[PDB]
Ligand binder design. Structure first.
Ligand SMILES: NCc1ccc(C(F)(F)F)cc1
Ligand SMILES: NCc1ccc(C(F)(F)F)cc1
Length: 330
């Protein structure tokens, strides 16, 4: 079997992407943030503290004939940005673009952090990292991808994110019309539970390509690109008036500047991120200082190939027994 669904930016800056997901019988459609950096499927629900819900669509397990409470199971998650949420667990039927999984763990949020309450457009997350990171206690639960793996024509899913435009998540097959040239595959380490790989280097604008191993994770759930300080300093040195602002918490640049592109290596192939992708607009309404989409990972402890990088490519998450990542230009 296969599945195909459209994913759409939540705002004019591509801060996140939402994808409709059907939960329960009869279907309740929620717009989830597909997150290859985490492994929990959790939703706003009828159980969420009422003051912490501000416009989200909620899952109501009492109205699903296939919902089963998972006795004694709880969950609690903290993300790298300080966000968090927690609650109890149901099993239910979940469908993504016509691909169905019965008995999927649906984690009902009882408590959510402020950043989630303020994002009216995201009803929950669908984690697509490896199941070892799932936070359900005392019995760990599998992700949607892991549960669907056996029924899929091929144990893969692909991420085709749009720049200021809708995109596609596909499960079970690789659309050979969605990219140009060849797909370059690279080895994945699962030892930390992430889609972790090693980039072979980078270039700034038309500059010389610098061969250097950059270890990082492919994370649809993270907006920006986070790379080591040396690389990020080399990029922003090419933008007149750019500087790192402690009060703003990152590199900023004059909104009137033109940004150079950024190239990152995948084996012997190159993925080029257009400079326009690196512009995240004014730091505040009316400001002439703009926020940059390439930031330092020094404070994070790991490099993150977030949406800024991934939307420049067609990306294959190959969940074979030896997992690999595929990158192609598009
Ligand atoms: N998108 C989920 C996510 C968020 C943060 C991290 C960090 F910070 F641990 F790298 C990993 C995964
Ligand atoms: N990396 C996972 C993640 C995704 C979205 C959010 C937001 F946007 F709700 F803050 C936080 C964390």
């Amino acid at each position: 079997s296969t599945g195909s669904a459209t994913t759409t930016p939540i705002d004019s800056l591509d801060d996140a992407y939402i994808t409709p997901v059907q939960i329960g019988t009869p279907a309740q459609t929620l717009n989830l943030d597909f997150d290859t950096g985490s492994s929990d499927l959790w939703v706003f629900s009828s159980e969420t503290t009422a003051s912490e819900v501000d416009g989200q669509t909620i899952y109501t397990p009492s109205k699903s004939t296939t919902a089963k409470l998972l006795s004694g199971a709880t969950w609690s998650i903290s993300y790298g940005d300080g966000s968090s949420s927690s609650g109890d667990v149901y099993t239910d039927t979940v469908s993504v673009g016509g691909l169905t999984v019965t008995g999927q763990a649906v984690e009902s949020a009882k408590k959510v952090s402020s950043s989630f309450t303020e994002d009216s457009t995201i009803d929950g997350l669908l984690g697509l990292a490896f199941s070892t990171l799932n936070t359900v206690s005392p019995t760990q639960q599998k992700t949607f991808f892991d549960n669907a793996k056996a029924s899929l024509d091929s144990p893969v899913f692909t991420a085709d994110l749009g720049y200021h435009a809708p995109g596609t998540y596909n499960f079970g097959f690789i659309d050979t019309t969605a990219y140009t040239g060849s797909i370059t595959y690279t080895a994945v380490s699962t030892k930390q539970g992430f889609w972790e790989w090693t980039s072979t280097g980078y270039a700034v604008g038309s500059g010389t390509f610098k061969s250097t191993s950059i270890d990082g994770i492919a994370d649809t759930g993270t907006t920006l690109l986070y790379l080591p300080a040396t690389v990020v300093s080399a990029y922003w040195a090419q933008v007149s008036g750019a500087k790192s602002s402690s009060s703003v918490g990152g590199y900023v640049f004059p909104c009137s500047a033109t940004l150079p592109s950024f190239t990152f290596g995948v084996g012997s192939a190159r993925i080029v991120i257009p400079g326009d992708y690196i512009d995240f607009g004014p730091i505040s309404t009316g400001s002439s200082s703009c926020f940059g989409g390439i930031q330092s990972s020094a404070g994070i402890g790991i490099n993150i190939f977030g949406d800024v990088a991934l939307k420049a490519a067609f990306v294959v998450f190959n969940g074979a027994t030896t997992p690999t990542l595929g990158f192609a230009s598009k």
